[PDB]
Specification:
The chain is an alpha+beta fold. The protein has a domain of 29 residues. It contains 1 helix and 2 strands. It has a two-stranded antiparallel ribbon with strand order 1-2. The longest helix has 9 residues. The radius of gyration is 25 Å and the shape is rod-shaped. It comes from Liocheles australasiae (Dwarf wood scorpion).
């Protein structure tokens, strides 16, 4: 017989996306009474939450 020899069909590749960061247009200059300090600070961390009359809320 002397059968042949071959078995090279490996690769494994399915991963090239990782972030999970970014708002959805709503916490940007839309609050009633937000301070540039809170807006800038919250924007720097790209954290989105809710706009409070007392200040901005990052979530």
């Amino acid at each position: 017989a002397k059968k042949p020899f071959v078995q090279r069909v490996k690769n494994a590749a399915s991963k090239a996306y990782n972030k999970l960061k970014g708002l959805a247009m709503q916490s940007q200059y839309g609050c009633p009474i937000i301070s540039n300090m809170c807006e800038d600070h919250c924007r720097r961390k790209k954290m989105e939450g809710q706009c409070d009359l007392l200040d901005c809320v990052c979530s």
